[PDB]
Design a protein around this ligand. Sequence first.
Ligand SMILES: CCOCc1nc2c(N)nc3ccccc3c2n1CC(C)(C)O
Length: 155
Amino acid sequence: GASRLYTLVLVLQPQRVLLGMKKRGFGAGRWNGFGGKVQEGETIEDGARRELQEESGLTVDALHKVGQIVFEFVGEPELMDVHVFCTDSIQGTPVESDEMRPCWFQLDQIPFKDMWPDDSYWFPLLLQKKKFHGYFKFQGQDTILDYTLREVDTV
Ligand SMILES: CCOCc1nc2c(N)nc3ccccc3c2n1CC(C)(C)O
């Protein structure tokens, strides 16, 4: 099956994580990291930085690749190849964008019920400073039917 490149960025500080609420459309109200498609004409890391900046107004001094996840959807031939990054080196104050409303969450209050269902599986690994490869099969946007998570030394 064919695949397309995407990014996902977690701003993860010692005691808190930044998530953004999706403001627009039928998917509004879901809370998640920052990211989008990787464009022709930018690197994966360029795309991750661009989406972070566009969505939260933040720039970073460094991004660390912590995961790679393949998403498959029931009835959909195209796969998502998602490169997952973490940062604790943001260079300003999170601010609202057209698309996302950033908010800080304490690490004992991660809003899993209001996040993409896959986050419940891999975000715990990220908190343990583990790197991973993942695969998730979705029914629609709310349900996982199959998955695999593997700890790796190198992403
Ligand atoms: C609006 C920015 O949303 C960040 C995000 N977070 C997740 C997530 N936790 N899980 C996902 C599962 C399947 C498809 C996309 C996503 C996803 N996405 C969309 C994606 C393009 C992969 O970053």
